[PDB]
Amino acid sequence: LTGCKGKGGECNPLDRQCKELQAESASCGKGQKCCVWLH
């Protein structure tokens, strides 16, 4: 469903094994994206 938690989740590198967004990757800025921890 959701690729973050609320305040922003956690910022990770683009070359990572976790979820990704376009609207919330801007919270991390330019060069990172938002990820999750659930399965």
PDB file of C-alpha atoms in Angstrom:
ATOM      1  CA  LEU A   1       0.000   0.000   0.000  1.00  0.00           C
ATOM      2  CA  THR A   2       2.233   2.804   1.387  1.00  0.00           C
ATOM      3  CA  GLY A   3       5.967   3.278   0.600  1.00  0.00           C
ATOM      4  CA  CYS A   4       6.581   5.391   3.795  1.00  0.00           C
ATOM      5  CA  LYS A   5       5.284   5.637   7.418  1.00  0.00           C
ATOM      6  CA  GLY A   6       4.104   9.278   7.937  1.00  0.00           C
ATOM      7  CA  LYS A   7       6.727  11.980   8.762  1.00  0.00           C
ATOM      8  CA  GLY A   8       8.804  10.442   5.903  1.00  0.00           C
ATOM      9  CA  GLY A   9       9.771   6.797   6.752  1.00  0.00           C
ATOM     10  CA  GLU A  10      13.515   6.239   6.091  1.00  0.00           C
ATOM     11  CA  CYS A  11      15.693   7.554   3.234  1.00  0.00           C
ATOM     12  CA  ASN A  12      17.766   4.922   1.358  1.00  0.00           C
ATOM     13  CA  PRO A  13      19.965   4.786  -1.814  1.00  0.00           C
ATOM     14  CA  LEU A  14      18.322   4.132  -5.215  1.00  0.00           C
ATOM     15  CA  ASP A  15      20.406   0.924  -5.592  1.00  0.00           C
ATOM     16  CA  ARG A  16      18.723  -0.759  -2.559  1.00  0.00           C
ATOM     17  CA  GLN A  17      16.414  -3.773  -2.077  1.00  0.00           C
ATOM     18  CA  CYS A  18      13.374  -1.851  -0.769  1.00  0.00           C
ATOM     19  CA  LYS A  19      10.230   0.038  -1.995  1.00  0.00           C
ATOM     20  CA  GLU A  20      10.241   3.354  -3.969  1.00  0.00           C
ATOM     21  CA  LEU A  21       8.030   6.422  -4.618  1.00  0.00           C
ATOM     22  CA  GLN A  22       8.085   9.621  -6.739  1.00  0.00           C
ATOM     23  CA  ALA A  23       6.066  12.023  -4.510  1.00  0.00           C
ATOM     24  CA  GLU A  24       7.948  11.123  -1.253  1.00  0.00           C
ATOM     25  CA  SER A  25      11.466  10.566  -2.734  1.00  0.00           C
ATOM     26  CA  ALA A  26      11.528  14.426  -2.892  1.00  0.00           C
ATOM     27  CA  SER A  27      11.491  14.431   0.975  1.00  0.00           C
ATOM     28  CA  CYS A  28      14.959  12.766   0.822  1.00  0.00           C
ATOM     29  CA  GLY A  29      15.851  15.252  -1.992  1.00  0.00           C
ATOM     30  CA  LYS A  30      17.853  14.382  -5.142  1.00  0.00           C
ATOM     31  CA  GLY A  31      19.730  11.019  -5.072  1.00  0.00           C
ATOM     32  CA  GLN A  32      17.604   8.970  -2.567  1.00  0.00           C
ATOM     33  CA  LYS A  33      14.104   7.457  -2.130  1.00  0.00           C
ATOM     34  CA  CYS A  34      11.677   6.349   0.618  1.00  0.00           C
ATOM     35  CA  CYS A  35      11.561   2.710   1.841  1.00  0.00           C
ATOM     36  CA  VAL A  36       9.704   0.366   4.249  1.00  0.00           C
ATOM     37  CA  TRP A  37      10.533  -2.508   6.666  1.00  0.00           C
ATOM     38  CA  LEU A  38       7.385  -4.770   6.536  1.00  0.00           C
ATOM     39  CA  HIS A  39       6.885  -7.824   4.242  1.00  0.00           C
TER      40      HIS A  39
END
